[PDB]
Design a protein around this ligand. Structure first.
Ligand SMILES: [Fe+3]
Ligand SMILES: [Fe+3]
Ligand SMILES: [Fe+3]
Ligand SMILES: [Fe+3]
Lengths: 169, 169, 169, 169
């Protein structure tokens, strides 16, 4: 194996490769949303900015995992990035509800990875998950839930969506 | 008795200790409200910041009473701090109405303390009450009154509550 | 359940509510000590400043748990804050011994909470406990242990207590 | 009467002239103490500085009363300023105990003058006494009481007195 590899189970190596793909998909989904909200018939620049940054953040998460794979002596194997499940995301609220579901899907995958790492007695990998991923994921989920509540209070359609969009800008 | 005590009736000493507890309880109530408004299903950050600052202020009022007790040679007697009357505070308006009632309750207590101090010929204590508490208390009640009127004008539910929350943040 | 809740066991939510109350109690104890040391017949301003800071920090610890509860979609339940276990804390050494006892009690509670979190496979919570509480608690205990040893060397009564008080101011 | 005189009773005017003399007498006491502690066979420069400052503040208190007399249209009547009955003040502790007694004597006089002003329905004069004198008097008494306690802790003779003196420099 690698001259560096130590206490790194092939199962964790495989799950990290799966997670790289999932973070890249999430980046792609938020990229889709970002430009959906820049359509002339949608025109929600705060939502667009929010999801642009989210797409950037998820691709950075993916790259941290790739760096981690190399750090531990595993081999990055990239897989096809799936097309986003939708081409058009509906209302601001529906996009937020889709994002909340995706963040929780990612969170479940991260927790299943953490279970794999713990089961193989890899505390270097549990630390990575805990400090660089699971922490941000709970914060992102809380943030999106907050936004869902706020938009439902303001609107969620019409003038309330227009005003809520301004808080994201 | 204390080497510093002079013209300090035991009834005023005891009333100060009751007021310390009342200030600490008000701080607790506003701390409860502050974090209620940060629930993911409430998400009113302006209401949260307002009540956080109110909680800090009330704790400061308690400490000023404790400092005063020591200054006069009285002895601080601390008691349990009661649970807040509610765990869920409802709408922003209902929370403001609760706060208005609590401020007027505290105002009543302070005015009764002033009567005790006045009946015992303690001008140092009537000065404290007038300058450090009764003035602040009337200003707070007026503020909360204004806020209730503004929120009723804005909403008090839906978009108007969303927009009012912005002026507190 | 909350729209954000995920992998958050009801026993962990309940234990966090218990811990919030314990941190608020610890804040209350140090607040009592702080103003005990400002009595005209005690007059230890360094002790007073130390326990004033300790009280603020414990109140901050409680608020971080409250923020955490909301982040995970649990619901804050606030209870009565018991009166501090004394009204008069004796010598500087006796108050530090009492503070040591309390810090270790709080540590035991946090370690029990970590066991609850660990047993329910909640690494977000074990991370919070390790990084935001357990680390600080061990530093706190060591600091107080050092101070007890220093005061016993200096005094613990008379000129030694007077001189030691100056290193905390 | 004076073109400015309004709601100013002759008993209040008389008591203010009496109080002026008491403040000048207090200033003289503290001047006596100040230079006693600079004797080569006493050599307590911290005590000397403290009592020098105290002497200056009592003289300022007398001048504020003289200014007040003029403001109300009363006429200042100045009398002999008695020397202290005791000028061999003894130890630092003995001087602090004498200062505490003097401070409480002045306070009792101020409180009697408040009663006179209140009985003659003079709110301008009660305001003066509460804000310019009674407030500072309680703060002065608390400070000297604190010092007596610290000095007893430190010493009150020998090394502890030498060290306590440094705190006042
Ligand atoms: Fe991610
Ligand atoms: Fe208050
Ligand atoms: Fe704590
Ligand atoms: Fe004076």
């Amino acid at each position: 194996a690698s001259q560096v590899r130590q206490n790194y189970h092939e199962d964790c190596e495989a799950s990290i490769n799966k997670q790289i793909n999932m973070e890249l998909y999430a980046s792609y989904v938020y990229l889709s949303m970002a430009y959906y909200f820049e359509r002339d018939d949608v025109a929600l620049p705060g939502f667009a900015k929010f999801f642009k940054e989210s797409s950037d953040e998820e691709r950075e998460h993916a790259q941290t995992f790739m760096k981690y794979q190399n750090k531990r002596g595993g081999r990055i194997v990239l897989q096809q990035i799936a097309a986003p499940s939708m081409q058009e995301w509906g209302t601001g609220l529906e996009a937020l509800q889709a994002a909340l579901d995706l963040e929780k899907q990612v969170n479940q995958s991260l927790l299943e990875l953490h279970s794999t790492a713990s089961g193989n007695n890899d505390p270097h990998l549990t630390k990575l998950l805990e400090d660089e991923y699971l922490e941000e994921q709970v914060d992102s989920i809380k943030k999106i839930g907050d936004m869902i509540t706020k938009l439902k209070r303001a609107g969620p359609r019409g003038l309330g969506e227009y005003m809520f969009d301004k808080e994201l800008n």
